[PDB]
């Protein structure tokens, strides 16, 4: 495993709302929960910015994280991400936030502590370009 | 290359509908075909769950796969994924299924065996958190 | 870092429109700018194909790139990608193009040289399948 520093921004986290964790040893992602104080309605076509109450610091520039929709919420309820895929840079230290977009025609309720997205840590490569007139092998 | 076990769930696979394969030596993804018995209409804004007739077992927890829209179908026909990006965990052993979402204003027909998404195998990192009061280097 | 060959297809690139570059040492992605000659309107629900004026050649089959929405444009303006996520194969040598999709209810103007998406280089794994009757460890 790789160590990622995490700062708790809302005292509910770790008390009434658990920290993100892998469901199983073979899980690729961690479910991300929202830290709101009362249930929130997301109308058809509405986008709402939902806080997580946590900040992470990946630090290692060979690593990033992406925020993805949950499969069931996205397929069954059309509850996905307004930016489609959220990209977390290694030097980002602010709160993780979810752009929650209801792409369906049905109203949806988000309760405090609900899992609304998933977080996946991926290696990334920092490219340097070489400008050429023609491509070569 | 890396070996991924594949179980055929529908006898058409490998007979009338080919197994997923890289188009070229330099392809990042494999086209994923649907295993339906008759053509299916996907109306504007409709989401339909489409089977592939295959199950995979990635097994290695340092590896995952993602299901992505095809570029031409998504750009030209608005045929994309209802969950936007499908994440396949290393310990998932069920059938691969596509959440096919028509985001366009035109009706679309999916024929048996059509390529509707693409599958990409990516390394992933399992993070362990360290809860801190302030971030450090 | 890893060297990626880049061919300039429009003489504005590197003169009036900068080459893609990482904003910070810890950035995971590079902002991708559009190479159009006059401002372009993107109406609600409209998809437009926007050129970048550059081609890249990743070459290494263990590497790919993805094109993702920008977070603010996607969350605030609903300016995302019609194919949701663009996948760039290592053997692709054509112009990078953005499927720009306005998922919002507000008209949006794209100016020449605007950053409209981001590009991320990721390692990928080329799988070989082993067809089995039952999965094993
Ligand atoms: O869904 C998202 C996308 C981004 N970010 C964070 C992590 C990014 O590194 C940072 C800056 O976003 P940019 O506008 O620079 O992409 O915002 C989120 O909290 N959620
Ligand atoms: O588009 C998708 C997304 C997920 N899955 C499979 C692989 C996942 O590991 C499994 C469980 O999904 P979750 O609800 O746990 O994300 O479903 C698919 O078949 N297709
Ligand atoms: O948003 C996108 C998606 C793809 N491509 C390029 C890179 C791919 O390797 C190539 C071929 O696309 P396919 O139809 O084979 O996926 O098009 C783009 O320019 N932009």
Q: State the CB neighbour count (10 A cutoff) for residue C12.
A: 17
Strand partners, C102: C79
Q: Which two tokens stand for residue A46?
A: 């509405």
List the one residue out of A78, C93, C60 whose CA is nearest residue B81.
A78
B97 CB within 6 A, ligand 2:
yes
Q: Among all chains, which residue has been given the structure tokens 């499969």?
A: A71
Touching chains, C (3+ CB pairs < 8 A): A, B
The answer to whether C71 contacts A128, with C-beta atoms less than 8 Å apart, is no
* 3-state class (DSSP) for residue C76: helix
Residue A84 is classified by DSSP as S
Q: Which two tokens stand for residue B88?
A: 């396949």
How far from A130 is each of C40, C54, C64, CA to CA, in Å?
A: 30, 12, 17
- Backbone angles phi and psi of C106, in degrees to 5: -120, 135
Touching chains, A (3+ CB pairs < 8 A): B, C
Within 13 Å, how many C-alpha atoms sit on residue B119's CB side?
Answer: 28
- Backbone angles phi and psi of B73, in degrees to 5: -60, -40
List the one residue out of C80, C62, C63 whose CA is nearest residue C71.
C80
List the one residue out of C74, C124, A51 whose CA is nearest residue B84.
C74
Q: Which two tokens stand for residue B59?
A: 């097994």
Q: Which helix (H) or strand (E) holds A52?
A: strand A47-57
Output the CA C14–ligand 2 centroid distance in Å. Answer: 43
Q: Which two tokens stand for residue C75?
A: 């969350």
Q: By the 8 A CB rule, do B95 and B9 touch? A: yes
Q: Which helix (H) or strand (E) holds B72?
A: helix B71-72
d(CA B86, CA B69): 10
The residues near B40 (Cβ < 8 Å, ≥ 6 apart) are B48, B50, B109, B110
Residue-range domains of chain A with CATH: 1-137 (2.70.40.10)
Strand partners, A26: none
Strand partners, B65: B88, B121
How far from B88 is each of A120, B74, B83, B95, C63, CA to CA, in Å?
A: 11, 21, 12, 11, 20
Q: Which two tokens stand for residue B122?
A: 């990516």
Q: Among all chains, which residue has been given the structure tokens 């990928």?
A: C124
The residues near A49 (Cβ < 8 Å, ≥ 6 apart) are A97, A98, A99, A100, C75
Q: Residue whose CA is closest, atom 16 of ligand 1?
A: C71
Which chain A residues contact residue C81 at CB under 8 A?
84
The residues near A24 (Cβ < 8 Å, ≥ 6 apart) are B89, B91
Ligand nearest the Cα atom of residue C92: 3
**Interface residue ranges in chain B relative to chain C, Cβ cutoff 8 Å:** 1-8, 14, 19-20, 22, 24-30, 55-57, 59, 63, 68-71, 73-75, 78, 80-81, 84-85, 93, 103, 105, 118, 120-123
- Backbone angles phi and psi of C28, in degrees to 5: -85, -30
List the one residue out of C87, C122, C123, C119 whose CA is nearest residue C23.
C119
Ligand nearest the Cα atom of residue C72: 1
User: Parallel, antiparallel, or unpaired: how do β-strands B108-110 and B40-42 relate?
Assistant: antiparallel
Q: Which two tokens stand for residue A15?
A: 């008390």
B86 CB within 6 A, ligand 2:
yes
Within 13 Å, how many C-alpha atoms sit on residue C24's CB side?
Answer: 10
Q: By the 8 A CB rule, do C113 and C33 touch? A: yes
The residues near A51 (Cβ < 8 Å, ≥ 6 apart) are A9, A10, A34, A35, A36, A95, A97, A98
The residues near C22 (Cβ < 8 Å, ≥ 6 apart) are A126, C29, C30
The residues near B41 (Cβ < 8 Å, ≥ 6 apart) are B107, B108, B109, B110
B71 CB within 6 A, ligand 3:
yes
Resolution (A): 2.0
d(CA B122, CA B104): 29
How far from B96 is each of B20, B92, C132, CA to CA, in Å?
A: 12, 9, 16
Q: Torsion over CA of B85, B89, B92 and B98, rounded to 10 degrees? A: 10
Query: Which candidate in A51, A60, A126 is best for mutational testing of the C interface (most C CBs within 10 A)?
Result: A126
Q: Among all chains, which residue has been given the structure tokens 């993100």?
A: A20
How far from A84 is each of A108, A134, C82, CA to CA, in Å?
A: 18, 35, 11
* Dihedral sign of CA atoms B51, B42, B77, B104 in order: negative
The answer to whether C122 contacts A125, with C-beta atoms less than 8 Å apart, is yes
Q: State the CB neighbour count (10 A cutoff) for residue B95.
A: 15
CB-neighbour burial class of residue B110 (10 A; exposed 0-12, middle 13-18, buried 19+): buried
Mutation choice for ligand 2 from B97, B99, B117, CB with most ligand atoms inside 8 A? B97
d(CA A45, CA A52): 22
3-state helix, strand, coil in chain A (%, to 5): 5, 50, 45
Q: By the 8 A CB rule, do C118 and C68 touch? A: yes
- Backbone angles phi and psi of A117, in degrees to 5: -150, 180
Q: State the CB neighbour count (10 A cutoff) for residue B24.
A: 11
- Backbone angles phi and psi of C71, in degrees to 5: -70, -45
Question: Among partner residues A4, A25, A84, which is closest to B129 by beta-carbon distance?
Answer: A4
Q: Which two tokens stand for residue C37?
A: 């000659």
Contacts 24+ apart (CB under 8 A), B85-88: B85/A68, B85/A69, B85/A84, B85/A85, B85/C84, B85/C85, B86/A71, B86/B117, B87/A28, B87/A29, B87/A68, B87/A71, B87/A118, B87/A120, B88/A28, B88/B56, B88/B58, B88/B64, B88/B119
The answer to whether B5 contacts C47, with C-beta atoms less than 8 Å apart, is no
Length of chain A: 137
């Amino acid at each position: 495993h790789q160590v990622i520093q995490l700062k708790i921004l809302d005292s509910r986290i770790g008390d009434t709302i658990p920290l993100p964790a892998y469901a199983t040893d073979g899980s690729a992602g961690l479910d991300l929960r929202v830290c709101i104080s009362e249930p929130m309605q997301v109308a058809p076509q509405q986008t709402v910015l939902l806080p997580t109450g946590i900040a992470i610091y990946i630090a290692d520039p060979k690593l990033a994280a992406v925020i993805l929709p949950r499969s069931g919420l996205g397929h069954k309820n059309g509850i996905v991400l307004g930016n489609l895929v959220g990209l977390i840079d290694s030097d980002y230290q602010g709160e993780l936030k979810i752009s929650c977009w209801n792409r369906s025609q049905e109203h949806f309720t988000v309760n405090p502590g609900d899992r609304i997205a998933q977080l996946v840590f991926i290696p990334v490569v920092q490219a340097s370009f070489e400008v050429v007139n023609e491509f070569t092998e």
